[PDB]
Amino acid sequence: GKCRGLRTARKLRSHRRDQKWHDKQYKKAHLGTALKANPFGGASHAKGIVLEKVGVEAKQPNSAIRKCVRV
Amino acid sequence: MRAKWRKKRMRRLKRKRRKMRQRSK
Amino acid sequence: GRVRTKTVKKAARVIIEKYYTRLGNDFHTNKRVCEEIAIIPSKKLRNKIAGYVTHLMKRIQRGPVRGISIKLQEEERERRDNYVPEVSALDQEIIEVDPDTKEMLKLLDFGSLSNLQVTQPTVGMNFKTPRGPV
Amino acid sequence: GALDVLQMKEEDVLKFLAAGTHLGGTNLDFQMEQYIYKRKSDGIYIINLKRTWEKLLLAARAIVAIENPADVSVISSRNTGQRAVLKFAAATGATPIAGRFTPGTFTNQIQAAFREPRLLVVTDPRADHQPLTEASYVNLPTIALCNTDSPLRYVDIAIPCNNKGAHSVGLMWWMLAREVLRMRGTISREHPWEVMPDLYFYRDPEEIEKEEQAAAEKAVT
Amino acid sequence: MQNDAGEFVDLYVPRKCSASNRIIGAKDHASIQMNVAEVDKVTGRFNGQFKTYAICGAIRRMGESDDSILRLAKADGIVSKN
Amino acid sequence: VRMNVLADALKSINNAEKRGKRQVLIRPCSKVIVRFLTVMMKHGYIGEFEIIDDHRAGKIVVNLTGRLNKCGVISPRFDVQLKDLEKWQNNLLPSRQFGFIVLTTSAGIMDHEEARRKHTGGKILGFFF
Amino acid sequence: TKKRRNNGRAKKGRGHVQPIRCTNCARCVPKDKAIKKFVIRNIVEAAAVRDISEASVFDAYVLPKLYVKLHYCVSCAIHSKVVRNRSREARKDRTPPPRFRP
Amino acid sequence: EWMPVTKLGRLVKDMKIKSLEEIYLFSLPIKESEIIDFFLGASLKDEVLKIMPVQKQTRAGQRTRFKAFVAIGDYNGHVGLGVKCSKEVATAIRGAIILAKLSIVPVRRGYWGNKIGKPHTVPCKVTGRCGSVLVRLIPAPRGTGIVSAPVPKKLLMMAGIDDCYTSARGCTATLGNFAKATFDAISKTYSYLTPDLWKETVFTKSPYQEFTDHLVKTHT
RNA sequence: AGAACGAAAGUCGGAGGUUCGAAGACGAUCAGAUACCGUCGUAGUUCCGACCAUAAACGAUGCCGACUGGCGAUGCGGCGGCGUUAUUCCCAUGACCCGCCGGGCAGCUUCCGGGAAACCAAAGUCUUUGGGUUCCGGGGGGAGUAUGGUUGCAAAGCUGAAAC
RNA sequence: UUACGGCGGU
Numbered sequence A: 001g002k003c004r005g006l007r008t009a010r011k012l013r014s015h016r017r018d019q020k021w022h023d024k025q026y027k028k029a030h031l032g033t034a035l036k037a038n039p040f041g042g043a044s045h046a047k048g049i050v051l052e053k054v055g056v057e058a059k060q061p062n063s064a065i066r067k068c069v070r071v
Numbered sequence B: 001m002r003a004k005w006r007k008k009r010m011r012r013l014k015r016k017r018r019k020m021r022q023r024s025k
Numbered sequence C: 001g002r003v004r005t006k007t008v009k010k011a012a013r014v015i016i017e018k019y020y021t022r023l024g025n026d027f028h029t030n031k032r033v034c035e036e037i038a039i040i041p042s043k044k045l046r047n048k049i050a051g052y053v054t055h056l057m058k059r060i061q062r063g064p065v066r067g068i069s070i071k072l073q074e075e076e077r078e079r080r081d082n083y084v085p086e087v088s089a090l091d092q093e094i095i096e097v098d099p100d101t102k103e104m105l106k107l108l109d110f111g112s113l114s115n116l117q118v119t120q121p122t123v124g125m126n127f128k129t130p131r132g133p134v
Numbered sequence D: 001g002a003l004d005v006l007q008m009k010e011e012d013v014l015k016f017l018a019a020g021t022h023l024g025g026t027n028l029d030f031q032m033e034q035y036i037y038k039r040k041s042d043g044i045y046i047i048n049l050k051r052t053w054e055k056l057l058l059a060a061r062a063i064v065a066i067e068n069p070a071d072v073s074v075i076s077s078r079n080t081g082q083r084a085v086l087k088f089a090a091a092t093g094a095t096p097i098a099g100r101f102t103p104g105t106f107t108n109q110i111q112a113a114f115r116e117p118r119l120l121v122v123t124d125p126r127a128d129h130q131p132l133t134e135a136s137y138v139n140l141p142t143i144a145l146c147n148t149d150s151p152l153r154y155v156d157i158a159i160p161c162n163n164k165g166a167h168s169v170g171l172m173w174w175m176l177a178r179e180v181l182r183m184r185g186t187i188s189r190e191h192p193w194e195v196m197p198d199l200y201f202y203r204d205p206e207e208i209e210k211e212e213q214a215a216a217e218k219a220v221t
Numbered sequence E: 001m002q003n004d005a006g007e008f009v010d011l012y013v014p015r016k017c018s019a020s021n022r023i024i025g026a027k028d029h030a031s032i033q034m035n036v037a038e039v040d041k042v043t044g045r046f047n048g049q050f051k052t053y054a055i056c057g058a059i060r061r062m063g064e065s066d067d068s069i070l071r072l073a074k075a076d077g078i079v080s081k082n
Numbered sequence F: 001v002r003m004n005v006l007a008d009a010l011k012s013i014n015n016a017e018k019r020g021k022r023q024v025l026i027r028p029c030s031k032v033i034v035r036f037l038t039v040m041m042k043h044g045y046i047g048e049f050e051i052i053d054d055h056r057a058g059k060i061v062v063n064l065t066g067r068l069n070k071c072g073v074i075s076p077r078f079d080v081q082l083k084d085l086e087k088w089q090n091n092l093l094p095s096r097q098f099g100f101i102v103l104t105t106s107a108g109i110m111d112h113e114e115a116r117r118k119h120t121g122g123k124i125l126g127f128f129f
Numbered sequence G: 001t002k003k004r005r006n007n008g009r010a011k012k013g014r015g016h017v018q019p020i021r022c023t024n025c026a027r028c029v030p031k032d033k034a035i036k037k038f039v040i041r042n043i044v045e046a047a048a049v050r051d052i053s054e055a056s057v058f059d060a061y062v063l064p065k066l067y068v069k070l071h072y073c074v075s076c077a078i079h080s081k082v083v084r085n086r087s088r089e090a091r092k093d094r095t096p097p098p099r100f101r102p
Numbered sequence H: 001e002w003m004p005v006t007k008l009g010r011l012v013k014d015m016k017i018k019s020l021e022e023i024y025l026f027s028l029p030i031k032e033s034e035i036i037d038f039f040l041g042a043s044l045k046d047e048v049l050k051i052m053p054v055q056k057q058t059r060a061g062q063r064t065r066f067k068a069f070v071a072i073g074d075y076n077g078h079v080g081l082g083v084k085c086s087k088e089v090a091t092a093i094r095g096a097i098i099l100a101k102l103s104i105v106p107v108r109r110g111y112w113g114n115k116i117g118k119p120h121t122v123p124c125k126v127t128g129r130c131g132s133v134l135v136r137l138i139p140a141p142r143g144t145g146i147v148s149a150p151v152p153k154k155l156l157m158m159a160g161i162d163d164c165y166t167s168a169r170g171c172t173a174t175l176g177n178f179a180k181a182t183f184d185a186i187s188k189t190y191s192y193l194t195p196d197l198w199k200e201t202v203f204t205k206s207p208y209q210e211f212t213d214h215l216v217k218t219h220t
Numbered sequence I: 001a002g003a004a005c006g007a008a009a010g011u012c013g014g015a016g017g018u019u020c021g022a023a024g025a026c027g028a029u030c031a032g033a034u035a036c037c038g039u040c041g042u043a044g045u046u047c048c049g050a051c052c053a054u055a056a057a058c059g060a061u062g063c064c065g066a067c068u069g070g071c072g073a074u075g076c077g078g079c080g081g082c083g084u085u086a087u088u089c090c091c092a093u094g095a096c097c098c099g100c101c102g103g104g105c106a107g108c109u110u111c112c113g114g115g116a117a118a119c120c121a122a123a124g125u126c127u128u129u130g131g132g133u134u135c136c137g138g139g140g141g142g143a144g145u146a147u148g149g150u151u152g153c154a155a156a157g158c159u160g161a162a163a164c
Numbered sequence J: 001u002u003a004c005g006g007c008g009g010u
């Protein structure tokens, strides 16, 4: 079981902070490799230049060509 | 593929790149 | 292929339950009785009912079949309600006990109100049949 | 039975001991240690007769407390207990079930085999348990004359007598028939009740009609 | 159920088991209420009245209603007095 | 390795009242658990109890009345201030009409209703309803 | 799912039992998973009894029995039909089948 | 046009039993849906919750049946929840109204404090589990309203309760079990001993012994 | 934190080498047989010494404490009793017989209660949630991979991500 | 004794 006594606030608060590193949406927001990885760099929009029209093919039950670019 | 034989073909493969790195230091 | 379906057996049971006083172990009379007293849509199930009627004639003349007919229900009263025996099976005035249950009837305070001879339990403790297969 | 009119009345001890009624076989349920006296050297548990007398009166007070006499249902599944249940119900005016107890009698209100009783009394707890667990659905108090083997789940006035021998079962239905009539103006407590306890016993095999005519060449001819 | 005005604001009052003091519910269909007709002293016959005892289905299913209804016959002068 | 004896005492009472029993046996006695039981006897949840005085730690036999729902314990003896007391009430009481968080004050083991009649916040010791 | 309460094996208070070997296929099984069968077959093949007792040098000869203990892996106990696949509620009985000798 | 077949429906048509609250306290098994329709007629609305198509696989295609969840109740302390499968929607949904009135329980109402008038909330906090879903109904102060998901609020408003804090854990997207869990919580508001229910009950006379006239004199 | 021991396989060294037997050789069977099957057979299997420290190392259930149904049986102690059998023609202890008490490996029944259910007398005493304390889980993969440290003669072990 | 496969979406 867990710790319950009026003296274990060091064990409880240290056991919570290292078990927070085990869900994604805390760890992608607090470990910093995930914001040094997304090409927006932590933003919502980005201007860029177009290199190539490229058409990817749709997934498993569908069949169409999704029109994409190579910004 | 069986998990103990997925283990073998990556234990065989991690000694293959433990040697490539050791080769080209 | 002889085995008789449920409508043959059920309708023949309601004849023998209800018109037992008119029937017998002759096939060719029961065929005429069941023609007159039932409503039978064709001739083939008529005498296929009547044959099962004669079968149960030899069957209920032997013993208590599922037979709520008035005679087979009345004669059992001569067993369960009669046979009040002229002597009793509880009244023999020489009945055995063991010396532990003479102690039981003494703290009921009936030790001197009864005759109640004792029998000693023979030495033993050889109950509890032996364990294990063989 | 805290009275003097309801005391043990020593003649029945001569009837109890001449029918079994105090011999419980070899193991006991944990809820019947209060009813038992001691174990023999045979292993047979013998039963305090003061305890089985006081419950039989207590069972009788429940049956007298039912207003309609044709409303208590008296039931039996095994054969040793089917003759007693027929003329217990004739005596105290109950309604019997002998033979197989069809499941769905107390709770399935559609078919015409629907009895709706207020109190039920049983020959045997573990051998006639289908009416017990079905009384559990329809909030119905149950008496069951029980032996030391028998488990005591839904029973209420479990009579700790016997349910194995044929002399014991018929006498206990006789003793319960006698006293439930004697708590009315039917038997005065004074004269002995002339209905014989041999009348409620389980019936002999087929030599019945043979033995009686072998000693009746002087009454018919 | 005795508000501050002092009134009964309650659909009914439920029974409770004379063995384990707990409430018989509205659809506990194993709960019995049964009568014990006591007898008058001198003649030993049925005098007209009785006593009622309610046994809830949870303590009736556990198998000690016979221990129960003897014990509340023990307190109420019917049993043996030994 | 009986770290709390009030926790063990109140667990045994709670198992037996849901079982249907009329008497329990509480095998170690202390003065903390006899002043716990003489808060719920006075409110009326248990009855006559005897302390069986022996020369090691005594036993207690309690007569269960049936009116007890749960008699749990808060096993870290948390401290409660009188500003903090009202939110301890609605966490572990079933209603506001009945049930008591019983807590040890400087002036004795009390109720929560008795404790705010005085002005003497303390350490929360257990609850019962 | 756990199929059986014991794990098909009669070990409770141990860590390890001896391996024994199957009789027909020689497979390594533990001593308490293995399906045992003790055979007390008479060596004379009972059709051939009244052809040797007349050829005997006695008038009443006690014919010796043969006492061979079999034990099987359960992959060969099921195929040889010495045990049978059972229903999920007729499984909780450890009583053996009847004998039916005459 | 209803002739009864049981004792309990027999004593209600001739108007010898009055105002259901005693056959609740003698814990009768109600058998016919006309008894509850007899007392609580013209005070019952019947609205359904969900019609879900359960189905089974067969040798030739699939048996497709329908599973109706209906809640019935007045606004003064009575609720039912009935569930019935049938092959077709309209006949499944019709027989569930019978099964919902046939299983009707009284809900107990209480106060948050300041017991000033008509009771408005649950007397204590209660719980109902059904499979994995536990519904916790918590007494709210006066003037709150029902703070819950829609489908337990459909049954609490149909229980004649004013205001109730509510929490819930589990697969609450399992409408049938999330309706029977909250129905179980309002099925045990009277199965809970509060200190206004301490004094030992006087036992009145049950209708099977108090009405033995109409069975013996009139039925026979 | 830091240690002790830890199946089998494996490594280093020495004894030994019957049987079995990875590898390999062949004979078959096969569309193909680098498999099943058969004949032979190296390392290995056995012992001593030194290492490695992992298993479906599983009751897939951490340890300590308490409370909460029943029944028969078993193993080891202890206590009490009819009797039976031992040199005993008397003994005391042995063997059985009937119980009780404690610790144990389990079983059978149960609407104790629990649980998503299989099932569990614990996996119960839990929204009526708090007996102590340790380890550990957070959708599936990538991945027990990468790299850093560290242990090892090696094989590898422990620690252990992210991009996607 | 031998019995190996069965396009994608519906």
Ligand SMILES: [Zn+2]
Pocket: G022, G023, G024, G025, G026, G027, G072, G073, G074, G075, G076, G077
């Ligand atoms: Zn084999």
